[PDB]
Amino acid sequence: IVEGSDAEIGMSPWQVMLFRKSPQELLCGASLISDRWVLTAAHCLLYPPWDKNFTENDLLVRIGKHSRTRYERNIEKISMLEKIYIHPRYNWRENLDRDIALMKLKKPVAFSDYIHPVCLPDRETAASLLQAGYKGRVTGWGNLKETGQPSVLQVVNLPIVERPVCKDSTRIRITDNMFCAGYKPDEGKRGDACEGDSGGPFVMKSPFNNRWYQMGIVSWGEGCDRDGKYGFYTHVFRLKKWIQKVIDQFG
Template sequence: MWREQCILLFTYFGAIWAQLSPACALKNGDLGVCISYERCDAATNTIIGDQSNIIKPGYEQNLIQCPQPQVCCSFTNNWTTTTTTTTTTTTGTDSVEKCGVQKRAKVSNFHKTMTDEAEPGEFPWAVNLMIVNNILATAAKYKYVGTGSLIHERVVLTAAHVLFGKNPDNLIAVIGEHDQKKKVMEKRSKTVQYCTIHEQYDGTNGDYNFGLIFLTESALKDNLPSAGTVCLPPADYAPPAGTRCVFAGWGVDYHLENQNQLVKVDVPMMGHAECERRFQQAPTLGPGFRFLPSLTCAGGEGTRNLCGGAGGSPLVCPMEGQPGRFFQIGIVTWTTDCGKDGAPMAFANVAAVRPWLDEQLDNFVKELSIGMN
């Protein structure tokens, strides 16, 4: 495992397993119930909405390991840290923070400077990743290195190539960012304690381009109105081809101009076979090119692209049957010639490594439980 020595105190992030109604054991030892993925809030691992048709399990029941794509879900928000009990609340009718919900904010005197600029709070999970700038003493203290997504209040998902070779002590994650040069919304910088890169990451072709950043404290503790988490998809889930999804990040546009503002690009999802065929038509790849299983792709619409610096940006798709909620399908990885040849963009396929994501978090919880210090 690629990792640095550091300590992380974070709330339990439940693994996704599951099936309807039998009792199951949560990682903290409490009882949960096997329930459909859509009915369990991925950010809090608690049941969404009405529970009247669910029988709360008793200790006399036999516990099972819930079969995918269902989950072992808690009836109450009982996550704990090593020092305090935390509950995430929102305004309105929801008692717990929902993942994948946009939080557009009304900002006085805000005006878009470009067509594709995101609205403030439109992508509350977008994280601006910065590193200490040691190049010029007169330059800004930090420089941008990539984009990430908040998948849990203490965990950021990004591309492995963004983290590769970086010292976590020199990284910060900016929550609530919109414009890198000026303040649009309230934002906070969080320090990094621990980073993990997928063991099979290959920097030559973008295979298994997944990285995790663990923060020293909750990214949501400041109650920023436009900060929130994005949901993760079930293992091996693939949106239907043609689904319009969107990625948002900071980087370089089609005209090779730096974008200090958070930019969004909506793109159609593309099936694996069609994606491979389109890439084979790119002059820089050719007919021998093979598209890796750890990748997914979308786009192919020419200027609907970002051409550099957007590595790690989350590609999110709308949830079926849950209007207004999104889960993260991909991570911006690479494209060819800014897509000028009609080639799509390659994204690390989040659903393909869902078990790996759960394993990393579970293993860390076990380390904490035996007194890691």
């Protein structure tokens, strides 16, 4: 996260850390959407241009974390992967369309003050909240700048950006499965996701039932906190069908 702030303890209890066994290291952000399922971005697991194709056995899931590098004894919980599920039409070749994957855990994680799942939007919450100017919150342990690593979970609030502005900011072909977020050069304030934040949650708090919803998954950007450029997020409601398919058929 760039120009973000230190997370309060318990502020993001759905935040998950994709962790690399050997060599031990942060792979990506992710989120907890139930006691056995974790949501993340597809490119965190599969990205052939970079020679990335992880399997379950390669990874660990670390839930309830605050500190980036520290092993938070009695607080965090580390889960083993049972199965990985990548969207069958994930477009790593062109624009990262449909950048989303599910990770079924080996054993149920136990909730606590530090561990708790976020909601997934229904059509009516998406329609009410996915609006230019409405702000969301993205979190993660990624770089503090484009060119470093934070000591604790970073937090930043960012306004959803108008689709024409999103499109006019880039040469990449953008889709309905994406939205962009970030301030304009105009708006003075700044901030963005960055490398390592990938697969992490863009959440909003519904003013209707006071619950936090994950609207977006950190997907891509051209640089980090670049003036006139925006963060791009997987549109989770647009792929909710796929998500409950996967969950409705594999337990």
